[PDB]
Scaffold this active site. Structure first.
Site, short mmCIF file in Angstrom:
data_model
loop_
_atom_site.label_atom_id
_atom_site.label_comp_id
_atom_site.label_asym_id
_atom_site.label_seq_id
_atom_site.Cartn_x
_atom_site.Cartn_y
_atom_site.Cartn_z
N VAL A 79 8.58 -1.32 2.39
CA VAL A 79 9.18 -0.05 1.91
C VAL A 79 8.28 1.10 2.37
O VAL A 79 7.08 1.07 2.06
CB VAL A 79 9.37 -0.06 0.38
CG1 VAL A 79 10.06 1.20 -0.09
CG2 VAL A 79 10.11 -1.30 -0.10
N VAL A 81 8.65 5.55 3.48
CA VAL A 81 9.26 6.84 3.88
C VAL A 81 8.23 7.58 4.74
O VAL A 81 7.03 7.53 4.40
CB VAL A 81 9.67 7.63 2.62
CG1 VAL A 81 10.12 9.04 2.95
CG2 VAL A 81 10.73 6.88 1.85
N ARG A 88 12.79 13.63 -0.72
CA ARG A 88 14.14 13.76 -0.11
C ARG A 88 15.09 12.71 -0.69
O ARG A 88 16.21 12.61 -0.18
CB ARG A 88 14.00 13.61 1.41
CG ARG A 88 14.72 14.69 2.20
CD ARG A 88 14.01 16.03 2.05
NE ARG A 88 12.95 16.19 3.03
CZ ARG A 88 13.14 16.46 4.32
NH1 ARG A 88 14.37 16.58 4.80
NH2 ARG A 88 12.10 16.61 5.12
N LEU A 90 14.94 9.56 -0.39
CA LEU A 90 15.12 8.49 0.62
C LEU A 90 14.82 7.12 -0.01
O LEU A 90 15.60 6.18 0.24
CB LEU A 90 14.24 8.76 1.85
CG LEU A 90 14.98 9.12 3.14
CD1 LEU A 90 15.87 10.34 2.94
CD2 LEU A 90 14.01 9.34 4.28
N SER A 115 2.39 -0.55 -4.36
CA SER A 115 1.29 0.21 -3.71
C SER A 115 0.61 1.10 -4.76
O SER A 115 -0.63 1.11 -4.80
CB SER A 115 1.81 1.00 -2.54
OG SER A 115 2.84 1.88 -2.96
N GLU A 116 1.40 1.81 -5.57
CA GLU A 116 0.94 2.56 -6.77
C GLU A 116 1.70 2.03 -7.99
O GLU A 116 2.77 1.45 -7.79
CB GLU A 116 1.23 4.06 -6.68
CG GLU A 116 0.87 4.73 -5.37
CD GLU A 116 1.48 6.12 -5.24
OE1 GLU A 116 1.41 6.71 -4.14
OE2 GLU A 116 2.05 6.62 -6.26
N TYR A 120 7.87 2.25 -9.38
CA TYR A 120 8.94 1.21 -9.40
C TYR A 120 9.53 1.01 -10.81
O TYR A 120 10.63 0.47 -10.90
CB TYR A 120 8.43 -0.04 -8.67
CG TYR A 120 8.38 0.10 -7.17
CD1 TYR A 120 9.55 0.34 -6.44
CD2 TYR A 120 7.19 0.05 -6.45
CE1 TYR A 120 9.55 0.52 -5.06
CE2 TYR A 120 7.17 0.22 -5.07
CZ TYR A 120 8.35 0.45 -4.37
OH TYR A 120 8.37 0.60 -3.02
N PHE A 396 3.16 -10.09 -1.06
CA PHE A 396 4.18 -9.83 -0.02
C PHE A 396 4.59 -8.36 -0.13
O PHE A 396 5.35 -7.84 0.68
CB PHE A 396 5.37 -10.78 -0.20
CG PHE A 396 6.09 -10.62 -1.51
CD1 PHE A 396 7.12 -9.69 -1.65
CD2 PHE A 396 5.75 -11.39 -2.61
CE1 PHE A 396 7.78 -9.54 -2.86
CE2 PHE A 396 6.41 -11.24 -3.81
CZ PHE A 396 7.43 -10.31 -3.93
C1 LIG Z 1 9.92 -7.32 8.93
C2 LIG Z 1 8.80 -8.01 8.19
C3 LIG Z 1 9.10 -7.83 6.70
C4 LIG Z 1 7.95 -7.98 5.71
C5 LIG Z 1 6.55 -7.94 6.33
C6 LIG Z 1 6.35 -7.66 7.72
S1 LIG Z 1 4.71 -7.73 8.08
C7 LIG Z 1 4.12 -8.08 6.56
N1 LIG Z 1 2.87 -8.26 6.11
C8 LIG Z 1 2.68 -8.53 4.83
S2 LIG Z 1 1.01 -8.82 4.26
C9 LIG Z 1 0.45 -7.65 2.99
C10 LIG Z 1 1.11 -7.81 1.63
C11 LIG Z 1 0.48 -6.78 0.67
N2 LIG Z 1 1.13 -5.77 0.49
C12 LIG Z 1 0.39 -4.61 0.97
C13 LIG Z 1 0.81 -3.26 0.35
C14 LIG Z 1 1.08 -3.31 -1.08
C15 LIG Z 1 2.00 -4.36 -1.42
C16 LIG Z 1 1.50 -5.72 -0.91
N3 LIG Z 1 3.68 -8.62 3.96
C17 LIG Z 1 4.93 -8.46 4.32
N4 LIG Z 1 5.95 -8.59 3.33
C18 LIG Z 1 5.20 -8.17 5.68
C19 LIG Z 1 7.50 -7.38 8.68
#
Ligand SMILES: C[C@@H]1C=Cc2c(sc3nc(SCCCN4CCCCC4)nc(N)c23)C1
Ligand SMILES: C[C@@H]1C=Cc2c(sc3nc(SCCCN4CCCCC4)nc(N)c23)C1
Ligand SMILES: C[C@@H]1C=Cc2c(sc3nc(SCCCN4CCCCC4)nc(N)c23)C1
Ligand SMILES: C[C@@H]1C=Cc2c(sc3nc(SCCCN4CCCCC4)nc(N)c23)C1
EC number: 2.3.1.-
Lengths: 396, 396, 396, 396
Positions: A79, A81, A88, A90, A115-116, A120, A396
């Site tokens: 996710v 923007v 906006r 979005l 992220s924060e 959500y 994820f």
């Molecule tokens: C199209 C595909 C969809 C999901 C996706 C990628 S790379 C990729 N890398 C990751 S590893 C970091 C997870 C931590 N995350 C970091 C920010 C805060 C939330 C938690 N995870 C995914 N779901 C994808 C591309």
């Protein structure tokens, strides 16, 4: 500003926005591995009348809930923007479209990592697991006489290269995830990614090692800059013997001052030591967030504490329906009713109750959850509790 | 090395050892105020064949346990061995004498706060309450729409000098302590000491202020060196309205960046905010430790969860007796038996279960608590739970 | 800019300049106590044609040198030039006048403690003692089986208020100072000042305690801000038994993480522990500086190593004379000669050799000390060595 | 748990245990270069009834001792027990086997560098060299008028790429090592490894440069993160002129604030500067540890101070023999005797005396070394002293 499913031509624009939105972004080669977990209409982009200024998608996941019950789960992810397109609506537009699609596809729940911590809640996501960091000062740590597996004869735990014991790790994790609320199926392509990050990078992370028990493993690495700190990236144990055995091995890293791990509030490690205080809590945060998509489906699907006797109430979820909720013999029947509500809460609150990490009592005290009967509150607290403590699988 | 009750002539030697053992020592004038809480044979000294090289004592306390039941409690305190007399079994000798006296006096439990977390387990003391520090970054904090007392009209909370509203503070605390497990009666002489430390000291602490609600108060002061940090020394609220109202007032300290408080794991504050993450857990530690002196008396005295149905088991405490334990309708009968034990634990473990802060499940996983029936484990978890969350009253 | 001896009217101006030059300045009341150690023509001021813009003075001290020989020593002190009068040769003028007076009074040596390490070399002062800070992480410290006084029965060391055992401290220090090179007679008025600083100040230092052995003592206090650090201000032991006994007591401060002490390079403490590395050297600096005023008097007065056999050489001190130096049976005869010099050095270098803290070899390697015979260099190294290690008494 | 010499098949398991035991591990390619210095039965592994859970080995080294005498030295190294196999006496078993082999092979001494300072004393290893870190604030540093090589005409020191002046570095080091106690022969394969680490690594260390004098060199590099700090990895000077010339060049690194070097307590650098205090001691630690394998062979092999006259004593080493020790004209005869012992010490203590870095006086004060005659103590101090200061060659 049109809201569409991406085409093959949109993915370069999406990987650019990803690179600029996420500092942890693992590059396009490895984004294509995670992309196998995105179903055919699982992604939305916003184009500017043209480049990608917004994206969101969901991955097909399998989440273990109390009662060792496994739910198809829409994992919200990727996710972003554009910084040029903030304020906006979005995110609101993208989240509304993905929720329509996730709901119509027949997912009972959606899940995400935030992220924060303030984005959500307004979309019906509630924090459902809790991350505890424990830092052990291993120089002072002695195991209690009561601790398992501290006798004569050979250790059951082996030091190994992770990359040579993939199958054993997979088989242990598979047992762990089916058995623990918050458990996720880890598909082949995420086992590919986990073991790629296990090797040393030039001016990056150090080599990861594994400690392997028949019923458990720990992956660990020395920290980039603090050479006296060992970071346990992951520890999966199916039995208490395995948990203790693995921690005896970690306390045995005699060149380290400190062992750090992201675990859960009910980790028994402190109770394995003569000094419970040596396992300090350095950090606490929300893990998995849940949005309950279908209230009757989710409430009926999970198991409830057998201890609390049969009882009935009327639950109202705000703009989410009203239900006659009947719980007994650890099962729930959840049916449409227009009877006066006895308990009200926003959708996000139910998310937070659903895996057992938050007590209805605690959410009532904050008035996130309204009732006039405190007997029902005690009964909800007890019913929604997990006998097996809720843990966090993987981000994820 | 003789072990005696002190005489008037020993107290100078005891205040010297106190000054050298405790950095927080409040001087002899104010030691004489706390000394009113020590009963006639509540103190032991060790003399060197002669000056005081060891001391220990207990204060007469009243501890609220689950079921709003109040126990006479021997509060262990002022424990010190001279640095010249370490590794001499002086603590073992003093603790053994005070335990004899506390037991023969008819105290069902003893309690203490630990200087280190690895001394007192071997004497049958178990950590029974948990301290959580929450640090709120109050610049980002907004209350959730669901939060109480955020409407039009006048605020029910007043900013006041603590020293001019003693009676109101006393009356609120008295309501709080009778109602909350971990609650202690605060005697007049500790109200004298609390309000003395409320005033600014030259090159010491800053002036303390109070926020006063009809059903709650908070004492707070700006930190010595961090002038953007407010330290809540104490917040007692009898109703959720009071807890929320008081926190609205604290978030209103617009010249502060951060508000810090030592509270408990179930503090609803995070759930009062749109971003639960703004209430970060900076620190966690054992609070009150309990030694159960009389197992049947303590187990029979407290209330049990009404949710779990009637059940019977045989509990063995290590070198502490074996009992037929029968729990139903929130009461327990605990009688001598020689029937085979179904659950075993050291005395300290029972301490940790007794106020509901630790789950039998968690202590079983560490093998601090042995049974072969996991149904009984679920039943203990549920039975020993407190509907009202366990909190920590004041350090002694 | 006139250079005079102060009159009674100059001392307010001198205490003002002192307050602005020294951050550690102890105020005028206590400056009057140290002033008893200044002899009648021991002080010079510079007035601006009028207020005091420069001052210097010397105190009458007694310094123990190798051979347990005690020298009348001019202790340079209270040296300050006004910040308005820098780069004016005021220090050069004042130091020249005091040196004339110290020399004509019949002092064989002068001594000082330096504010910076690059001021006093050019006036013939050489660093003559070395300060080592040892910080012990006392949580890991165990005494070696070989360490003295670690048996059964009572400890010979007592914890006491310093102010109640003045005579014992005085008597031990007096034994210590007569016996150790770098030893200074501590007069009554400095015992007055030491015990005044032993008591807690409001928003200042904490209460000092003492550990008292028949043949040794340690004064210590917890640090203002680091409450897990104990600072040994002073430890005087006459026997190894006393040194070990006192350190067993310090390692017994179980509420401290760390014990810190300013000691000397040859402190045996590291060798008392199973892990010599636990006594880390945190800090090193010059202690006492010596200017040899009369070369033949100083060289003849001290004892020399009995190990090295009789030998003769010609020493030249730069603008300080040339001498036939003959050393044997631990005595030296030092007589005027015009024979060709075999060894040359500036006056400051001799200062640094004189108490045995620096080796002639080391100063030769830097060419501070010139000879063409390396046999003579080995012979000087050996001769000028102290069998008893050189220590630092007190700053002045 | 069997204790064998490794076979070719064990070395993968040994490199895995090395990677997990040592953070500095240089990988298998470069482990094969150091492996050329391990003789045929120089290594032991422990297998678990099967993978490698323990290893130890020794390298063939040549150590310069006082008198410019070179000893075959067993260099203990690559010692590791698996974290899964701690507290199993595996180190005791491996050290006992290697000591048997080292002794039977005819090595007079063994040597090591310690990971912690409390492991190796109980195996007869004593700290024998001392590491001093000097940090120079080079912005304030001015050379004393007495310092060598500060005249008109061209500098004798050149800035060069290390990799283009291998032969000159080798030839200077070879002169240095033959001449200085603590000196080790550096074989070709360690010159290969030194110059490989001289080049910049991606996200690793920066390019190393050299300052080359006919009689000395310094290798230095700017620190990874502190870009105003230059780290001298190594400075070998055969003459004082070379030492001074090289330090003039280092003080000339005008873009650096600070120059840091690991050197020895007797480094003349402080005495080269007008302000000796500008060369601050930031760090001190044990360097080379010695275990004397054959007491008469080691004592007879080294040179003694010519200054002390002939004397005889009886030395007892604990479970190591008793000897009539006769020292005169800088030689020792050390013969079996059963005469009453006059001086006793554990084997490790002799290690610490052997290179001259510790004084018998200092070890007597700690009772690591017992005698009743303090005349003999002075005589040992003097005899065992090195005219050339003991230095540390390279870590192994
Ligand atoms: C199209 C595909 C969809 C999901 C996706 C990628 S790379 C990729 N890398 C990751 S590893 C970091 C997870 C931590 N995350 C970091 C920010 C805060 C939330 C938690 N995870 C995914 N779901 C994808 C591309
Ligand atoms: C004779 C009388 C007996 C108890 C007593 C005094 S002063 C006095 N001050 C205090 S305040 C600090 C409590 C924190 N404590 C600090 C160390 C760790 C445990 C927790 N408490 C007392 N019980 C007494 C003298
Ligand atoms: C007139 C009389 C003469 C000396 C004198 C005073 S106060 C007074 N305080 C001290 S205590 C600090 C010593 C450290 N010192 C601090 C700066 C660096 C050198 C070392 N010492 C004195 N000699 C006097 C007034
Ligand atoms: C089989 C062969 C035997 C010795 C050996 C290797 S790599 C290799 N690397 C080094 S470099 C680091 C020395 C510092 N050391 C680090 C830890 C503390 C002691 C001091 N040294 C070796 N002897 C070997 C493999």
């Amino acid at each position: 500003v049109t809201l569409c499913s991406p085409t093959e031509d949109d993915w370069p624009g999406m990987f650019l926005l990803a690179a600029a939105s996420f500092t942890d972004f693992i590059g396009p080669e490895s984004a294509t591995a995670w992309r196998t977990l995105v179903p055919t209409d699982g992604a939305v982009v916003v184009r500017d009348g043209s480049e990608v200024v917004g994206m969101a998608l969901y991955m097909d996941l399998r989440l273990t809930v109390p009662g060792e019950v496994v739910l198809p789960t829409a994992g919200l992810s990727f996710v972003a923007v554009a910084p040029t397109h903030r304020r906006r609506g979005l995110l609101r537009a993208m989240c509304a479209e993905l929720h329509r699609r996730i709901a119509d596809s027949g997912y009972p729940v959606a899940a995400l990592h935030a992220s924060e911590g303030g984005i959500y809640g307004r979309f019906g996501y509630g924090p459902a697991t809790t991350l505890h960091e424990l830092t052990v000062d291993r120089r002072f740590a002695r195991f209690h006489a009561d601790a398992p597996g501290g006798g004569l004869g050979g250790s059951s735990v082996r030091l190994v290269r992770p990359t040579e014991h993939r199958g054993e790790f997979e088989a242990i994790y598979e047992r762990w995830r089916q058995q623990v609320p918050g458990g996720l199926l880890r598909p082949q392509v995420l086992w590919d990614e986990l073991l790629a990050e296990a090797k040393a990078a030039p001016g990056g992370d150090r080599e990861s090692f594994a400690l392997l028990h028949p019923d458990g493993y720990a992956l660990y690495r020395v920290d980039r800059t603090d050479l006296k700190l060992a970071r346990v990236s992951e520890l999966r144990a199916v039995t208490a013997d395995a948990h203790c055995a693995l921690w005896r091995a970690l306390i045995g890293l005699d060149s380290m001052e400190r062992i750090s791990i992201i675990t859960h509030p009910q980790d028994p490690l402190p109770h394995l030591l003569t000094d419970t205080r040596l396992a300090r809590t350095t950090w606490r945060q929300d893990g998995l967030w849940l949005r309950i998509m279908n209230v009757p489906a989710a409430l009926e699907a999970r198991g409830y504490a057998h201890e609390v006797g049969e009882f009935s109430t009327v639950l109202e979820v705000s703009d989410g329906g009203r239900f006659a909720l009947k719980i007994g013999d650890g099962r729930a029947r959840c049916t449409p009713t227009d009877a006066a509500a006895e308990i009200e809460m926003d959708r996000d609150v139910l998310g937070s109750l659903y895996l057992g990490a938050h007590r209805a009592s605690t959410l009532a005290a904050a008035n996130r959850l309204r009732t006039k009967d405190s007997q029902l509150l005690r009964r909800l607290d007890a019913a929604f509790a997990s006998d097996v403590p809720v843990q966090t699988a993987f981000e994820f």
